C-alpha cells in the first residue's frame, strides 16, 4: 500500500478504480497535437509499457522477501529512465504517462523499496492497460 500519485493515494484496494478514472480522462478530451490533435495512443505503445513492467513483475511475482533486492530496484529505476526517454519521443505517449501518473508510482516504489508496493504498482498498470481495452481498441 501507500502508493503516492501526486493528487491522491492508491492503496492496494484502489488501483482499478483509479486506472478506469484515468482511462476515462484519457478517452475523454483526446490529445491535442500540432494539427489540433487528435489521435490517441496505440495498443502497441502501451504494449511497451506493459512488457517493461512485466519484465520485473515476472522476476518479483515468485519470491518471499518483503523488500525488493538491489537487482530489482535497479530494473525499476531503469523502467523509470525508459519511460522518461520514450515520452520525449512522442507527445501522445507523454500525455498517457502524465494523466496516468506512472512516474510518481515508480518513484514511490523506489522509495518504499518493498515487494508489496511494486506489486500494487504493477497491478495498477495492468488494470490501466485492461481498461484502455474495452474502451478504445485498434
Amino acid at each position: 500500500t501507500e502508493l503516492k500519485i501526486g493528487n491522491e493515494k492508491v492503496n492496494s484496494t484502489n488501483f482499478g478504480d483509479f486506472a478506469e478514472k484515468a482511462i476515462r480522462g484519457i478517452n475523454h478530451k483526446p490529445f491535442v497535437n500540432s494539427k489540433g490533435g487528435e489521435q490517441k495512443i496505440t495498443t502497441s505503445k502501451i504494449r511497451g509499457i506493459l512488457e517493461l513492467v512485466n519484465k520485473v513483475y515476472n522476476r518479483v511475482i515468485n519470491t518471499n522477501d518483503v523488500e525488493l533486492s538491489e537487482n530489482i530496484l535497479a530494473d525499476i529505476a531503469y523502467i523509470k529512465v525508459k519511460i522518461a526517454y520514450e515520452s520525449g519521443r512522442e507527445p501522445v505517449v507523454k500525455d498517457f504517462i502524465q494523466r496516468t501518473a506512472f512516474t510518481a508510482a515508480i518513484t514511490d516504489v523506489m522509495n518504499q523499496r518493498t515487494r508489496e508496493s511494486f506489486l500494487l504498482f504493477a497491478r495498477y498498470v495492468e488494470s490501466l492497460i485492461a481498461y484502455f481495452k474495452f474502451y478504445g481498441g485498434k
Partner: protein, 252 residues
C-alpha cells in the same frame, strides 16, 4: 436417475410457524366455537397429509416423503427435487392459508451412507436457524419466516429475498449454459475469491479488471458487467445463487 447434477441426498424439514399461537390467540375470540376450531384443525391436517400426497402425485416427483402428519414435514429425495419442491410447498401453503401462517424449512446435503440420525439432527438445527431469523435485532421475538440452505449460517428468506435469489438462479442458468466452454474456468475463480469478503480485497478488484479486460465477440459486456453489478450489493445472495447453479449444472 439424474443425468446432470450432484450425488447428494437432499432433505426437507418444513414446520409451520406460530401454529400454537394461531390456536391460542390467532382465531378471533368473538368467532370462537368448537366447530370452527375443529374445522381449522381438520383443514390443516387434510392439507398436510392429503394435499402433500396429491401434490407429489400430480406429476413426476423424485420424493419419498417420510412424514407429513401435522405442523411438520420430513422429505428425502433428489437434491434438485427438494430445491424445486421447496418453492412449490411455499406457494401452495401461501395459497391454502391465504398468506396468514409462516413456514420455515431446512435443506441438507448428505452422502449415500451418511448417518440418518445425524441427517435428521443437522436438518433440525438448520431448521432452528431458519426459525430464529431476524432482519434487525430490535423487535421482540423472531420473524420465524426463513429457510436455511445447507448451512445454519446461510439463513435466507421466502420473501422478495428468495424471489431475487431464484430470479438470479434462473438468469444464470439461462445465460451460462453456453459459454466459449473454455473461459468458464473463471467461475471457480470467482467462487473461491468470493467465499468470504472480509480480507485482502485486491484480488476481487483484480478479477473485476480482468472481466473488463476480456474482449472478444460474445454476448458482449451487458451480463459480463451485470456480474459486477450484482457482485457488490448482493454478496451472500450471489454466492448462494451461484453455488445452487453450480450444483444443478455440475457434470457429475
Amino acid at each position: 436417475e439424474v443425468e446432470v447434477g450432484i450425488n447428494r441426498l437432499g432433505v426437507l424439514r418444513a414446520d409451520v410457524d406460530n401454529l400454537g399461537q394461531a390456536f391460542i390467540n390467532g382465531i378471533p375470540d368473538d368467532y370462537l366455537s368448537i366447530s370452527r376450531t375443529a374445522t381449522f384443525s381438520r383443514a390443516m391436517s387434510r392439507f398436510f397429509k392429503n394435499y402433500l400426497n396429491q401434490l407429489l402425485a400430480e406429476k413426476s416427483y423424485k420424493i419419498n416423503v417420510i412424514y407429513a402428519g401435522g405442523d411438520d414435514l420430513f422429505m428425502i429425495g433428489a437434491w434438485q427435487d427438494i430445491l424445486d419442491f421447496s418453492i412449490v410447498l411455499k406457494q401452495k401453503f401461501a395459497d391454502f392459508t391465504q398468506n396468514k401462517l409462516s413456514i420455515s424449512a431446512g435443506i441438507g446435503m448428505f452422502r449415500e451412507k451418511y448417518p440418518v440420525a445425524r441427517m435428521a439432527s443437522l436438518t433440525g438445527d438448520l431448521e432452528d436457524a431458519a426459525k430464529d431469523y431476524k432482519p434487525d435485532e430490535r423487535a421482540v421475538q423472531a420473524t420465524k419466516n426463513a429457510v436455511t440452505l445447507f448451512d445454519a449460517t446461510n439463513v435466507f428468506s421466502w420473501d422478495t429475498l428468495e424471489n431475487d435469489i431464484f430470479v438470479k438462479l434462473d438468469a444464470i442458468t439461462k445465460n451460462f449454459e453456453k459459454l466459449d466452454e473454455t473461459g468458464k474456468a473463471f467461475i471457480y475463480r470467482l467462487i473461491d475469491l468470493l467465499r468470504g469478503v472480509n480480507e485482502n480485497q485486491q484480488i476481487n478488484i483484480a478479477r473485476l479488471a480482468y472481466t473488463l479486460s476480456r474482449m472478444e465477440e460474445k454476448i458482449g459486456k451487458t451480463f459480463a458487467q451485470e456480474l459486477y453489478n450484482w457482485a457488490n450489493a448482493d454478496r451472500k445472495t450471489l454466492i448462494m445463487a451461484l453455488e445452487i447453479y453450480i450444483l444443478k449444472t455440475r457434470e457429475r
